[PDB]
TrEMBL record, chain A:
Coiled-coil residues: none
The name this protein goes by in its record: Family T1, proteasome alpha subunit, threonine peptidase
Superkingdom assignment: Eukaryota
Location of the Proteasome alpha-type subunits domain: 3-25
Alphabetical UniProt keywords: Proteasome
Family note: Belongs to the peptidase T1A family.
Cross-referenced Pfam families: Proteasome, Proteasome_A_N
InterPro entries to which the protein is assigned, alphabetical: Ntn_hydrolases_N, Proteasome_alpha, Proteasome_alpha-type, Proteasome_asu_N, Proteasome_sua/b
Gene3D superfamilies on file: Glutamine Phosphoribosylpyrophosphate, subunit 1, domain 1
A Gene Ontology cellular-component term: proteasome core complex, alpha-subunit complex
GO biological process, one term: proteasome-mediated ubiquitin-dependent protein catabolic process
From TrEMBL, chain B:
Protein name: Proteasome subunit alpha type
Similarity comment text for this entry: Belongs to the peptidase T1A family.
Matches recorded under Gene3D superfamilies: Glutamine Phosphoribosylpyrophosphate, subunit 1, domain 1
Subcellular location(s) of the protein: Cytoplasm; Nucleus
UniProtKB/TrEMBL annotation, chain C:
Complex formation: Component of the proteasome complex.
Name of the molecule in the record: Proteasome subunit beta
Keywords for this protein: Cytoplasm, Nucleus, Proteasome
Top-level taxon of origin: Eukaryota
Family: Belongs to the peptidase T1B family.
SUPFAM superfamilies: N-terminal nucleophile aminohydrolases (Ntn hydrolases)
Species in which this protein is naturally found: Trichomonas vaginalis (strain ATCC PRA-98 / G3)
Record has Nucleus as a keyword: yes
The protein's role, per its UniProt record: Component of the proteasome, a multicatalytic proteinase complex which is characterized by its ability to cleave peptides with Arg, Phe, Tyr, Leu, and Glu adjacent to the leaving group at neutral or slightly basic pH. The proteasome has an ATP-dependent proteolytic activity.
Keyword Ubl conjugation: no
Pfam families in the cross-refs: Proteasome (PF00227)
Gene3D superfamilies with a match to the protein in the record: Glutamine Phosphoribosylpyrophosphate, subunit 1, domain 1
UniProtKB/TrEMBL annotation, chain H:
Ranges where the Proteasome alpha-type subunits domain occurs: 4-26
Subcellular location, principal: cytoplasm
Organism the protein comes from: Trichomonas vaginalis (strain ATCC PRA-98 / G3)
Pfam families, per database record: Proteasome, Proteasome_A_N
UniProt name for this protein: Proteasome subunit alpha type
Subunit structure: The 26S proteasome consists of a 20S proteasome core and two 19S regulatory subunits.
Length: 225, 230, 205, 191, 234, 230, 229, 235, 230
């Protein structure tokens, strides 16, 4: 409590309490789920509707043609990170002319978040990103943390009620590598359904040859069964 | 450079630094700006040692030949506001050749105060400013009150500084929708006198006539109007 | 042609018997055109220091004002008048700070040493290459003419009258051979007691 | 190479300027007011590219007004002249204003200053910027008398402008003359 | 804590939540979207009759097609609307088209959370203003809500200010997707009147419509505000 | 200009003419081209007089500050490195062709530094316009471990050769003999003896002058005013 | 961001950091200065950390220029920084004006630097008080420069350890008519008064400005010559 | 960070910058400085902060010249006073370079007060704990005397005081100050007010006499120790 | 306890850098990673206690490439771990830009310890809660930098939880006597013996730099040693 002053302050236990507060800010975001097959990767999430007549706040974003990120936490910080990631993809498609690897984007966003947590006067991004990419590296899923680190996953859940989604993913973890695009999307939607408190769920799906695309609302009806 | 975010929100949602800047304003001398169809009048009460100092240090300033400006609050923060406002009037002339709109210059002063409320390492101006003047582009005299918060609002008759609520009540009671220039003078003078127990030797009254510059009321005409109001 | 030749100037300083004499043409010319005959090129820098700036009128005024800024600041911060040698080094610093965008004025410092009252002439080029002639310091577009006339004419130990005599005559000879210089002369005789400012008559063509 | 001519009198200053603005070989306007009224007391005739003259005039007028408003005192004619000189001295070395000016001001005393793009400041009884000086200075020298009346002053300025019209190859199609006196800057016609 | 960009143990930016509170201290404003247009009805708080109502305008036209109503700090909202106007004119300059409502909303939101402290020379605190951005894009009216946190959401109906929660509760059973612009104006003014502490009048209210038929965000005049307040059931 | 420094057994002899020309005209006939750097180091410079004077003053200040802070005797190679770096960073625009001549723990050292920053340790060096006329004497009369007087005469004769053969050089030969106060004691204090006007060529003096100076210019004084000197 | 000023006025108008730096001066080693008719003197009790210290390597009495000299009391490193700055200012003054920086100009530059460090942020005031001697036109001058940047001019003063007792001693045993030798004797006696045990020429450094108007540090031989008498 | 920051450029619950109020209190703890305007000049007087049997009163401590027409007495931190006097001298000479005219007194006072205010509103730095009695002459407003504050607030005063017992000195001036006084009368008034408020040794006092003469112009002379002693012995 | 633990640059009255000690605590919390120098190369083995079974098998690296000859095992705060990895890559690239050759682990460790030290030496930085073991066979170097910035070459380094026991076990083997392929089973046995039962799923991320890799960093192939365990 007394050491929860800055992101630059270590608590006597080695913990950065402001970093942990930002991580909790991510854990307070709406349920986000990511999956990874040998051919496709999926990010889905129950978008948040602050008001009854307000639309669901977009949660899935397309960083590059085969890269997308699902934000969980401060959506403004998520948009800032999306801007940064799109700049990184545009400078990798400028310097090298090809699409960056989602692993490199995870590295860059982790570096930026760590620099936010290592210099005073900066706050960790209050948003965690489930980034799915596809390329020469294959489909890859990364959960980037406010602390400045990204964890590579075959599946993952973050935000609120994400323990049920994590349990579902653990149960079906060995199914995912062979799951087709349609089956991976179905698994994503059925991991989110366990988190239900659809027109709220937005799902970005990418493949090795399939460019990243965002499906929302009725477009996902075919993947419920 | 130094950026300590002097102005931050409180749990109840208040910028305590803006409250303190308003307190600084409310310890400043009373200013009363009133308008007529063709003339604006500003009356600032003056606290001074008449036998030992020159009363020529005026709260009323002229940002431009058409923009009159009075203030309540810290005289140094007000001097900075007036200096920046004069610079902005001349820069608007440089950039447009047209006299700066009274709304434009009032917005600029309010935005200066607001930037001080927003810039780290910058103390909000402890000054509330009455930016008055005439626009040929609108054919309307204007009197805007810019606050330390950076909010500016046009008024038919506004007062700032100490005793601002009593003078506001006086203005509300004795305001006419279509006052003549002398009626505006009488309203401003009487509103200031309602809290001041001294005549011309204390009050300072300036005015701006349609398509005119700022003229400071004499110590003879001011006293005559004071007696007429009483 | 040349920027220095734009404003014709002719500044002279001579050393006498415990007295200096700084004379200057009074013409503000623009190339070949006479604009004024009341142009001040000699400025009093201190009670016993006079500075004649022979060169571009722009840089004459700029350098004079910059050295009045420096001398006033020095005398305020030190409560003491600036010495002729201290002011010479100040002018050298001022010109060499703009060495690579030089002022197009050659300064001529005519002063008297604070205590000994000895003559002190100090003429530099545009960039503060100060010389300290014990006899005469010349500057301006009449530089060759002034050098020639003062080499033969200047004599040691000239009293204020004789020092004025050559300062005026020698400057007249210089300006009358310079087309862009002349139109009246002004000679400041600096002595122990008084400064005598004599406006001398030169050719007005 | 525009013809601006100043003539200082005992208690007035007649400042005239070429009223013909031009683009290349085209006389765009025949009544362009090249004289800039920086203050109610000071009229600055400017010879140079119309854009440079306009920008410098606006900068100087804004600075004069800013001095009048910041401090409750108006610049003198010597103070304004040296402020213009400082501006030109700054400009020449870095980003030069290619304008040669005649600053005519009345602050209880008539003043006429010969100013150039470099920054040479000189109070003059009469003068000109452009090639017109080559034509008008002599006429002033020939016909200027100390204590010249305002009517004699207008006659002498008219003579100088007529000399510009007659002998200068690029004869200005007309001049705008302004009288700077205790009453301010008033535009006049010399006929 | 004690620094602006600090996270509570609950995972909230404390300055952001306090700016949300500041918005809750601002004047009420109801934005009702209907297929014909988006209608703002805003409480103009007049501390005196001498206060020129047109000068405390809580509604700002960002562009011809898009407008904005503020709640909270009028000066921070002025900064936000200034940024939005610059963004709209820059977008018209760069892409020869009106800026999308979502696009300008996202731009001002990105500006919103760029506050910082402790780093050498930026705003030092979040904007204490929530905007109801609305406008006509591609023959459609779009209504967006920005709050100090920098999050924006598209809204069919929204409320910002002191009566925001009560206004939303009243809108629960009062708002429908197919209302006419007449009905949208009536609902906005009714909700505002219900969530303000003074009798509704044309002078203490500001009404503005991003109208699809005109394709423009106009601000209603006193006559139009009277034309709406007259129809209200009270 | 003719500047020439050589190294004799006990030290260094630097020499310079005293003629500064403002083009084809001899501006100065007693110009000082030998610049004191430190008690052990003197630089005789050619090129632009302002550049030489200023760079020598600046490096003398640098080495005086060095000797003060560090208590260390400035080194001739140290002075030469500072001079060469400064002249290189100005890309030869500081036209100061310098000859550093000093005595440090490494003994008597003479370095040349070109205006562009190219330095070189040489036993005898001649720079300036008459540098060739001087170097001839230096080439023919310099030998390893010559005594002080022979090196003095050689450097003076080289400066005189530059004076007579070169138009840019003339007037007198100023010498500066850096030497250890006790030549037999290599650790003794390095002192300098400056021989101003070491050579005053009599054939190069003003040999004629009108005893009655003939002048037919009469001064007409327009106006006279006398002002006190205080 | 540490650009905030750590030297700030306290509730009563007392710059606590200035008082703290002054206390650092008061525990920084006694240094005395005495202004004679024909010169000035500044000595200090420079007792080394150990007999193994080489005195010349950390002389407390130092030259600012040919005419001005400085002794200090307080943080040795702060004095060295101020001394380098003052010597650099003097050489700059020589470059711009051809003469050594005047004594009062050196004092005012030291005072300006110290005030600057008492006002700008991220720094503490210099924890040294400087006794600067040098000649002005009207004669020799001794100047105290405090951490605040306020500079007294003294006929005599001590400002280090037990400096109150030493200043009372100077008040009691100082006369204007003292010569430079008399001033050196007065400074040595003041150091003896405020020093425990027998004073030694090794343990004190003396720097004097005399009729020559040039500042010179007395060698240990000269200091011992003065002590023996 | 900012744990050990004093909020020098931050407002207090009352609305006054507590660092400016503490600077004002520091001034009130400093030697009294008094200014009095007479017909064609202003006399400034001050009490030296460094006053001992050993202190050598070589040069003015509280009194400084800003230009040939402007002089300043100071109450408060003498170091901040020296810094702002250097800044004022540079500003006056800058105005002279720009306009070839002596800087108007009100504009130099506004410049030093803008500096002092900037230290109270930006940068989180310590305020200038000095109050200047800036006496001077300009053609515009004749001879003027301005009282500056650490806040950056200034006001013209016919006669005023700052420092210790500044209120007592102000009351004495109010009871005794006359208009259109002579240089001698105003100097004697300053002596009386100092003697009553303030010991009283002449060498402990500093005097400067700005005087505008149509012939010589505005002349500033800071009275030397001999002049101060002769003037005080006359009371 | 006392307040000396908030500012990284603050020293405890015992000379302890409490923030550096807390960064070291962050290192000690993490699962142990170690490195051993062997005859054929250097083997870096990082224990990855997989928090979730969903983590990619073989993903989430703790050993990183720094150069085509330098690998980097990382312990502690993984954000700081990868920050230091990327800063080491940048330092190697800058070293190549300035000097052309590829950096060596000793001087790479010095350059990165410079950043480690700057973190707790200048304010406005957080000490890196990570220990980085740079290994290079081509430099025969195994240098571990600690959170303080203390870097030492090791014959066998190890940091993290149970690092003392891991070092004690590494001490039992003369690693240079054996090659990397026979070192892998020994290190794997060490970590498995120290692996805590609470972590069911986990991995041994082994990398080696050897002649078999031509000195290039390379993850130990799965066939050689299946890194994944249950
Ligand atoms: C010498 O090179 C020379 C002198 O003015 C000389 C310059 C440097 C030291 C001071 C005196 N430089 C010149 O420009 C002329 C040209 C011929 O050589 C000069 C006399």
């Amino acid at each position: 409590s007394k050491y929860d002053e800055n992101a630059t302050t270590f608590s006597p236990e080695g913990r950065i309490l402001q970093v942990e507060n930002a991580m909790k800010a991510v854990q307070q975001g709406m349920p986000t789920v990511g999956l990874k097959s040998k051919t496709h990767a999926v990010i889905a999430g129950v978008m948040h509707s602050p008001s009854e007549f307000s639309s669901h706040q977009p949660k899935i974003f397309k960083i590059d043609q085969h890269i997308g990120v699902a934000i969980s936490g401060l959506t403004a910080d998520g948009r800032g990170l999306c801007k940064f990631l799109r700049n990184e993809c545009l400078h990798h498609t400028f310097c090298f002319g090809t699409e960056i690897r989602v692993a490199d984007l995870a590295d860059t966003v982790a570096l930026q978040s760590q620099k936010k947590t290592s210099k005073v006067g900066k706050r960790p991004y209050g948003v965690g990103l489930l980034m799915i990419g596809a390329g020469v590296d294959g489909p890859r899923l990364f959960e980037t943390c406010p602390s400045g680190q990204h964890w590579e996953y075959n599946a993952q859940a973050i935000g609120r009620r994400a323990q049920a989604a994590k349990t579902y993913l653990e149960t079906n973890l060995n199914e995912f590598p062979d799951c087709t695009r349609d089956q991976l999307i179905r698994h994503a939607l059925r991991a989110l359904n366990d988190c239900k408190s659809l027109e709220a769920i937005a799902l970005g799906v990418v493949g090795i040859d399939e460019p990243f695309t965002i499906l929302e609302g009725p477009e996902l009806q075919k993947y419920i069964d | 450079d130094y950026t300590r975010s002097i102005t931050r929100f409180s749990p109840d949602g208040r910028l305590f630094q803006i409250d303190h800047a308003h307190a600084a304003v409310q310890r400043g001398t009373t200013v009363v700006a009133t308008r007529s169809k063709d003339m604006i009048v500003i009356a600032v009460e003056k606290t001074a040692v008449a036998k030992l100092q020159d009363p020529h240090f005026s709260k009323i300033c002229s940002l431009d030949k058409h923009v009159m400006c009075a203030f309540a609050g810290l005289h140094a923060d007000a001097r900075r506001l007036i200096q920046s406002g004069q610079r902005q009037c001349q820069s608007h002339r440089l950039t447009y050749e047209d006299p700066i709109s009274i709304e434009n210059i009032a917005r600029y002063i309010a935005t200066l105060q607001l930037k001080n409320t927003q810039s780290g390492g910058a103390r909000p101006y402890g000054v509330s400013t009455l930016i008055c003047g005439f626009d040929d582009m609108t054919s309307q005299p204007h009197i805007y009150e810019t606050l330390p918060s950076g909010t500016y609002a046009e008024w038919k008759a506004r007062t700032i500084g100490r005793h601002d609520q009593t003078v506001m009540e006086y203005l509300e009671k004795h305001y006419k929708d279509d006052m003549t220039d002398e009626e505006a003078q009488k309203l401003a003078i009487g509103a200031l006198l309602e809290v001041v127990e001294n005549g011309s030797k204390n009050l300072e009254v300036a005015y701006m006539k349609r398509g005119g510059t700022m003229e400071i009321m004499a110590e003879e005409v001011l006293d005559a109007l004071i007696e007429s109001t009483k | 042609s040349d920027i220095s030749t734009y404003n014709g100037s002719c500044v002279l300083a001579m050393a006498g018997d415990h007295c200096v004499a700084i004379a200057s043409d009074r013409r503000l010319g623009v190339n070949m055109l006479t604009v004024s005959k009341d142009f001040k090129r000699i400025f009093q820098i201190n009670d016993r220091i006079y500075l004649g700036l022979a060169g571009l009128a722009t840089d004459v005024l700029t350098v004079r004002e910059q050295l009045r800024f420096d001398v006033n600041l020095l005398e305020l911060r030190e409560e003491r008048p600036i010495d002729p040698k201290k002011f010479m080094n100040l002018v050298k610093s001022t010109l060499y700070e703009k060495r690579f965008s030089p002022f197009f004025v050659t300064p001529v410092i005519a002063g008297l040493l604070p205590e000994t009252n000895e003559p002190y002439l100090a003429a530099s080029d545009s960039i503060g290459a100060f010389a300290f002639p014990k006899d005469f310091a010349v500057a301006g577009t009449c530089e060759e003419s002034l050098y020639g006339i003062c080499e033969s004419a200047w004599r040691p130990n000239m009293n204020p009258d004789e020092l004025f005599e050559c300062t005026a005559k020698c400057l007249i000879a210089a300006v009358e051979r310079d087309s862009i210089s002349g139109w009246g002369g002004i000679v400041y005789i600096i002595t122990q007691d008084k400064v005598i400012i004599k406006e001398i008559k030169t050719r007005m063509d | 190479m525009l013809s601006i001519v100043g003539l200082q009198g005992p208690d007035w200053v007649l400042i005239a300027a070429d009223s013909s603005v031009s683009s290349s070989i085209i006389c765009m306007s025949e009544n362009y007011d090249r004289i800039a009224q920086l203050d109610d007391r000071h009229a600055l005739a400017m010879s140079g590219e119309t854009g440079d003259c306009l920008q410098l005039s606006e900068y100087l007028q804004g600075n004069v007004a800013l001095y009048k408003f910041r401090n409750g005192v108006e610049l003198s004619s010597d103070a304004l002249a040296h402020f213009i000189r400082h501006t030109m001295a700054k400009a020449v070395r870095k980003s030069p204003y290619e304008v040669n000016m005649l600053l005519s001001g009345y602050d209880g005393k008539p003043h006429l200053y010969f100013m150039d793009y470099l920054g040479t400041l000189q109070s003059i009884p009469y003068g000109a910027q452009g090639y017109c000086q080559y034509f008008v200075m002599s006429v002033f020298d020939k016909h200027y008398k100390e204590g010249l009346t305002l009517e004699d002053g207008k006659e002498l300025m008219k003579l100088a402008l007529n000399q510009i019209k007659q002998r200068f190859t690029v004869a200005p199609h007309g001049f705008i003359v302004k009288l700077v006196d205790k009453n301010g800057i008033t535009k006049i016609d010399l006929e | 804590d004690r620094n602006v960009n600090t996270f509570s143990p609950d995972g909230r930016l404390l300055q952001v939540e306090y700016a949300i509170e500041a918005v809750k201290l601002g004047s009420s404003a109801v934005a009702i979207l209907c297929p014909e247009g988006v209608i703002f009805a805003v409480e103009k708080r007049l501390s005196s009759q001498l206060l020129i109502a047109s000068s405390v305008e809580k509604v700002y036209a960002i562009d011809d097609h898009v407008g904005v109503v503020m709640a909270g700090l009028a000066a921070d909202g002025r900064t936000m609307v200034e940024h939005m106007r610059v963004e709209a004119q820059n977008h018209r300059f760069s892409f020869d088209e009106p800026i999308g409502i979502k696009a300008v909303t996202q731009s001002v939101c990105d500006l919103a959370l760029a506050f910082g402290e402790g780093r050498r020379k930026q705003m030092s605190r979040p904007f204490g203003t929530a905007l109801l951005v609305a406008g006509i894009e591609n023959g459609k009216c779009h209504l967006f809500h920005t709050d100090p946190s920098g999050t924006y959401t598209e809204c069919r109906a929204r409320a910002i200010g002191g009566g925001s929660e009560g206004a939303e509760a009243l809108l629960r059973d009062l708002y429908k997707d197919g209302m006419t612009l007449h009905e949208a104006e009536d609902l906005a003014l009714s909700t505002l009147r219900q969530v303000i502490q003074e009798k509704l009048n044309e002078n203490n209210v500001e009404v503005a419509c991003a109208r699809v038929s005109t394709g423009k965000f106009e601000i209603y005049t006193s006559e139009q505000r009277q034309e709406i307040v007259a129809r209200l059931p009270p | 200009t003719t500047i020439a420094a050589a190294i004799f057994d006990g030290g260094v002899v630097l020499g310079a003419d005293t003629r500064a020309t403002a083009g084809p005209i001899v501006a100065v006939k007693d110009e000082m081209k030998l610049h004191y750097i430190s008690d052990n180091i003197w630089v005789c410079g050619a090129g632009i007089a302002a550049d030489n004077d200023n760079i020598n003053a600046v490096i003398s200040a640098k080495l005086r500050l060095f000797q003060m802070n560090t208590g260390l005797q400035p080194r001739v190679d140290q002075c030469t490195n500072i001079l060469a770096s400064r002249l290189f960073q100005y890309m030869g625009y500081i036209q100061a062709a310098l000859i550093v001549g000093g005595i440090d723990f490494q003994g008597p050292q003479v370095y040349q530094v070109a205006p562009h920053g190219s330095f070189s340790k040489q036993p005898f060096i001649a720079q300036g316009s008459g540098s060739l006329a001087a170097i001839s004497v230096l080439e023919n009369r310099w030998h390893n471990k010559m005594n002080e007087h022979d090196c003095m005469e050689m450097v003076a004769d080289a400066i005189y050769a530059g004076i007579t053969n070169d138009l840019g050089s003339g007037s007198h030969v100023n010498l500066c003999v850096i030497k250890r106060e006790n030549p037999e004691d290599k650790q003794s204090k390095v002192i300098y003896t400056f021989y101003k006007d070491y050579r005053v060529p009599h054939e190069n003096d003003r040999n004629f002058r009108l005893e009655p100076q003939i002048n037919n210019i009469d001064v007409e004084v327009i106006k006279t005013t006398e002002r006190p000197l205080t | 961001d540490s650009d905030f000023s750590l030297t700030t006025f306290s509730s009563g108008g007392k710059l606590n950091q200035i008082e703290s730096a002054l206390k650092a001066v008061s525990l920084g080693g006694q240094c005395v200065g005495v202004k004679a008719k024909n010169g000035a003197v500044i000595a200090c009790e420079s007792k080394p950390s150990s007999p193994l210290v080489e005195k010349v390597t950390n002389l407390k009495v130092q030259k600012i220029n040919d005419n001005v000299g400085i002794v200090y009391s307080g943080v040795n490193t702060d004095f060295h920084v101020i001394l380098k700055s003052l010597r650099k200012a003097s050489i700059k003054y020589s470059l711009r004006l051809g003469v050594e920086m005047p004594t009062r100009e050196v004092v005012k530059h030291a005072a300006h630097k110290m005030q600057y460090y008492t006002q700008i942020g991220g720094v503490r005031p210099f924890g040294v008080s400087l006794l600067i001697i040098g000649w002005e036109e009207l004669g020799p001058t001794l100047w105290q420069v405090d951490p605040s940047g306020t500079f007294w001019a003294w006929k005599a003063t001590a400002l280090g350890k037990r400096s109150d007792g030493s200043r009372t001693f100077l008040e009691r045993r100082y006369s204007e008519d003292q010569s430079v030798d008399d001033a050196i004797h007065t400074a040595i006696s003041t150091l003896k008064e405020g020093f425990d045990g027998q004073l030694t020429a090794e343990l004190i450094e003396i720097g004097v400005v005399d009729e020559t108007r040039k500042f010179r540090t007395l060698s240990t031989a000269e200091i011992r010559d003065f002590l023996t008498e | 960070t900012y744990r050990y920051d004093a909020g020098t450029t931050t407002f207090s619950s009352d609305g006054r910058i507590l660092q400016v109020e503490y600077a004002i209190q520091s001034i009130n703890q400093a030697g009294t400085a008094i200014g009095v305007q007479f017909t064609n000049g202003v006399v400034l007087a001050a009490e030296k902060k460094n006053t001992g049997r050993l202190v050598d009163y070589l040069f003015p401590e509280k009194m400084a010249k800003i230009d040939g027409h402007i002089v300043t007495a100071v109450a408060g931190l003498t170091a901040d006073a020296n810094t702002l006097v250097d800044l004022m001298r540079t500003s006056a000479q800058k105005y002279l370079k720009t306009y070839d005219e002596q800087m108007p007194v009100e504009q130099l006072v506004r410049m030093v007060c803008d500096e002092k205010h900037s230290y109270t509103q930006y940068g989180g730095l310590r305020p200038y704990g000095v109050s200047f009695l800036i006496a001077g002459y300009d053609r515009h407003k004749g001879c003027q005397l301005y009282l500056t504050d650490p806040s950056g607030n200034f006001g013209g005063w016919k006669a005023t005081a700052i420092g210790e017992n500044n209120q007592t000195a102000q009351s004495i001036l109010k009871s005794q100050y006359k208009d259109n006084m002579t240089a001698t009368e105003a100097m004697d008034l300053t002596v009386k007010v100092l003697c009553k408020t303030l010991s009283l040794s002449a060498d402990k006092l500093e005097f400067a006499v700005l005087q505008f003469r149509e012939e010589y112009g505005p002349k500033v002379r800071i009275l030397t120790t001999s002049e101060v002693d002769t003037l005080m012995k006359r009371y | 306890g006392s307040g000396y633990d908030f500012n990284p640059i603050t020293f405890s009255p015992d000379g302890r850098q409490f923030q550096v000690e807390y960064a070291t605590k962050a290192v000690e919390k993490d699962s142990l990673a170690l490195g051993v120098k062997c005859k054929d190369g250097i083997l870096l083995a990082a224990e990855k206690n997989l928090t979730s079974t969903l983590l990619t098998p073989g993903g989430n690296p703790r050993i990183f490439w720094i150069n085509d000859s330098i690998a980097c095992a990382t312990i502690g705060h993984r954000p700081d771990c990868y920050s230091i990895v990327e800063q080491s890559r940048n330092r190697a690239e800058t070293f190549t830009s300035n000097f052309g050759i590829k950096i060596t682990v000793p001087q790479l460790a010095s350059e990165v310890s410079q950043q480690f030290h700057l973190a707790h030496y200048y304010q406005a930085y957080r000490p890196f809660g990570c220990t980085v073991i740079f290994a290079s066979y081509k430099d025969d170097a195994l240098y571990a930098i600690e959170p303080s910035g203390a870097f030492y070459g090791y014959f066998a380094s190890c940091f993290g939880k149970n690092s003392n026991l891991a070092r004690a076990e590494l001490q039992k083997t003369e690693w240079k006597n054996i090659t990397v392929r026979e070192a892998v089973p020994e290190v794997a046995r060490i970590i498995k013996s120290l692996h805590e039962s609470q972590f069911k799923k986990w991995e041994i991320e082994m990398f080696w730099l050897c002649e078999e890799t031509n000195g290039r960093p390379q993850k130990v192939p799965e066939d050689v040693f299946q890194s994944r365990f249950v």
